[PDB]
Design a protein around this ligand. Structure first.
Ligand SMILES: Cn1nccc1C(=O)NCc1cccs1
Length: 281
């Protein structure tokens, strides 16, 4: 059981060592499409690429590329799209992907500015009466409502396909309090946030996969999916303590490289799952 494993690694301070074994065991697949020179300005970080086998393809004939990966967790019946924070020139691609994949929710785990640099383009409208048009992908986006709480903001958005005049409601879940450095002290507000996304229906098989992003789409985004999948497997299995976080992380790393960036994020993922298990048992 992971509670005992947590105390062991913690008391022995072996987090950097566990983390290195995961790094060495992790899959490596080709990322040829990401490295094409025509896609250079579609990537925020040159060292963070989707694998060709799991990459999301845009349905535009010109260039189908976006830095986004489909993570398919077969046993848990959960899918997620993990992507980078959009760039100024990829905001239209981002919303085209949301439209094409029939996603109901967008989960954002970063602020637009952190450590005095831009981590993400401002890709949603700030006021009801100032809608955004993406001319390149023929989509209109309107802020319908905004509910600001202490740790997170939920926004209702209307996305309209200008080509067909269909409209969908998208929920934007914005976790606003992840610190500039390190991880939250307690996983309580992160768990609260995860239960709010679950309650919305955004993670349900009726809809396309939820879109999850931070700046690179591997660190905080990784923590989100890892905690959700681990807690769901504890509901589903005859023996809840058969759930090995390290195994789940390695299975997720077959779909996108680098998920969980630091030993601190690994420790925080254990803590979130251990604490979340109390609300689930
Ligand atoms: C145009 N270009 N040549 C090489 C790399 C790039 C590029 O645009 N990379 C992504 C980012 C743009 C601004 C912040 S990050």
């Amino acid at each position: 059981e992971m509670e005992k494993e947590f105390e062991q690694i913690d008391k022995s301070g072996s987090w950097a060592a566990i983390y290195q074994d995961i790094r060495h065991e992790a899959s490596d697949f080709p990322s040829r499409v990401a490295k094409l020179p025509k896609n250079k300005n579609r990537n925020r970080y040159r060292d963070v690429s989707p694998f060709d086998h799991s990459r999301i393809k845009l349905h535009q004939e010109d260039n189908d590329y976006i830095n986004a990966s489909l993570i398919k967790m077969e046993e848990a019946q959960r899918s997620y799209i993990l992507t980078q924070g959009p760039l100024p020139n990829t905001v239209g691609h981002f919303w085209e992907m949301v439209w094409e994949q029939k996603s109901r929710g967008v989960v954002m785990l970063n602020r637009v500015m952190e450590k005095g640099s831009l981590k993400c383009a401002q890709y949603w409208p700030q006021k009801e009466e100032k809608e955004m048009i993406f001319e390149d992908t023929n989509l209109k986006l309107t802020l319908i409502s905004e509910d600001i709480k202490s740790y997170y903001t939920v926004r209702q958005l209307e996305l309209e396909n200008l080509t067909t005049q269909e409209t969908r409601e998208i929920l934007h879940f914005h976790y606003t309090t992840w610190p500039d450095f390190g991880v939250p002290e307690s996983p309580a507000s992160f768990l609260n946030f995860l239960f709010k996304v679950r309650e919305s229906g955004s993670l349900s098989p009726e809809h396309g996969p939820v879109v999850v992003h931070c700046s690179a789409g591997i660190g905080r985004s990784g923590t989100f999916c890892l905690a959700d999948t681990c807690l769901l497997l504890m509901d589903k299995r005859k023996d809840p303590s058969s759930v090995d976080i390290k195994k789940v992380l390695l299975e997720m790393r077959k779909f996108r490289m680098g998920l969980i960036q630091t030993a601190d994020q690994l420790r925080f993922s254990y803590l979130a799952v251990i604490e979340g298990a109390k609300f689930i048992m």
